[PDB]
Specification:
Two copies of one chain form a homodimer.
Chain A (H helix, E strand, L loop, with lengths): L1 E5 L14 E2 L2 E2 H11 L4 E6 L2 H9 L3 E4 L4 H11 L6 E4 L9 H12 L5 E7 L3 H4 L6 E4 L5 E5 L19 E10 H7 L6 H6 L4 H5 L4 E5 L11 H10 L1
Parallel strand pairs in A: 1-4, 1-6, 4-5, 7-11
Antiparallel strand pairs in A: 2-3, 6-10, 7-10, 8-9, 8-10
PDB class: transferase
Keywords: KdsB synthetase deoxy kdo complex, Lipopolysaccharide biosynthesis
Assembly: dimeric
């Protein structure tokens, strides 16, 4: 398998996000450390910023210069001319501590199943987080395919509440695996009315009647780096 | 083409002897039987474990199938009727609830035709939600569909979540919420087997039996009700209202 890291540069709160220093190396290079450890055969950082490109290349990383998240992966997939059956894992460029094991988990999951997309989830063990619409919840069928993803608290467990949340709740992790040919197709699809309601791009897949596999992360990752607080945390932990 | 089975629930708190509650010279169950005849069903069976219900249905010329006194879900009670009436597996069955004396005949036929066309486990119906109160009412089951009208998920939670709208307040709602209506269509062969599948854990979490279908990888088709039907009689108020 192959790892593509779409470094998003613009951001309120964290200006030069991929290039922010974490103990002597830039954040994007740290995500490069992890991807390599996953055993990936290609690790491509996708960006349209020269300064980022020179930082990855100085660390020995491959870069693909791009001209909407998934659409950036489509461009890299075309520019690299990967075959349709190539397994691709999308790792966000704000995750310098993502464990390599979970990168490999999603790849093996996609490899062993006949399905367009695989992804990962972790259990929710607290109510604040269960009713937080920033925590995307997911409900599964017996084989681990996603029935639905939502910012609503699903499944609605009227028994856990009301006691002052049990063990039925999963939080969706923003790491994805797909075959290259699926990515090619996916981005040509008209968007769905659902995705703009929920603000979850992944519902396009379920809307079109396609399947997404979800495994429980074999290792719970730390939160990404979106804020100065997240940056101070990650700085002290690495 | 199709058969209607009405599992009349007898014991209710706050109705009580529900199917037999008089509505202008006829008991509720007989009214539901009238609606079912109008749909062109080739058979309309009321399933019951009570003799008083049996006789009231039979006096109006309605077919009855006695079912076990051991407690049964509505579905489990249909599956007994299927066993007892010896319908072939490909027979199309519509489950119509017994507290719906005003149910339009056209929507009964809509569900049968919907099942007959597709090659799906279940067909069912939905209606749009207008009030934020109802959107946020856990007694109102929501459903979100895929592009071909198949349920992605049913839930008492407010799905789909309108994040930009609900970041500002829970006060208001767009025009996209769907409320699930408890009428169902399926094949005799399917129901026979489905009542023996072990429950999904989802079932007891959401208190929604139909999630069993989705849990085991089968599909439920959902059309928007062709004629918005009136509320089921579940309270003395519903009963006073329906008598007019």
């Amino acid at each position: 398998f192959v790892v593509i890291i779409p470094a998003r540069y613009a951001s309120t709160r964290l200006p030069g996000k991929p290039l922010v220093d974490i103990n002597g190396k830039p954040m994007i290079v740290h995500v490069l450390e992890r991807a390599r450890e996953s055993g990936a055969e290609r690790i491509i950082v996708a960006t349209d910023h020269e300064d980022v490109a020179r930082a990855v290349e100085a660390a020995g990383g491959e870069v693909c210069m791009t001209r909407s998240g998934t659409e950036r992966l489509a461009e890299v997939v075309e520019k690299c001319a990967f075959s349709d059956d190539t397994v691709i894992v999308n790792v966000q460029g704000d995750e310098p501590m993502i464990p390599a094991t979970i990168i490999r988990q999603v790849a093996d999951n996609l490899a062993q199943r006949q399905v367009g997309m695989a992804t990962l989830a972790v259990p929710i063990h607290n109510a604040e987080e269960a009713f937080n619409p920033n925590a995307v919840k997911v409900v599964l069928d017996a084989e681990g395919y996603a029935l639905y993803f939502s910012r609503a608290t699903i499944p609605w467990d009227r028994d856990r509440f009301a006691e002052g949340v049990g063990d039925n709740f999963l939080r969706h992790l923003g790491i994805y695996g797909y075959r290259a040919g699926f990515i090619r197709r996916y981005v040509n699809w008209q968007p769905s009315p659902l995705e703009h309601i929920e603000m979850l791009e992944q519902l396009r897949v379920l809307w079109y009647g396609e399947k997404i596999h979800v495994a429980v992360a074999q290792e719970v990752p730390g939160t990404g780096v979106d804020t100065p607080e997240d940056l101070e945390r990650v700085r002290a932990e690495m």
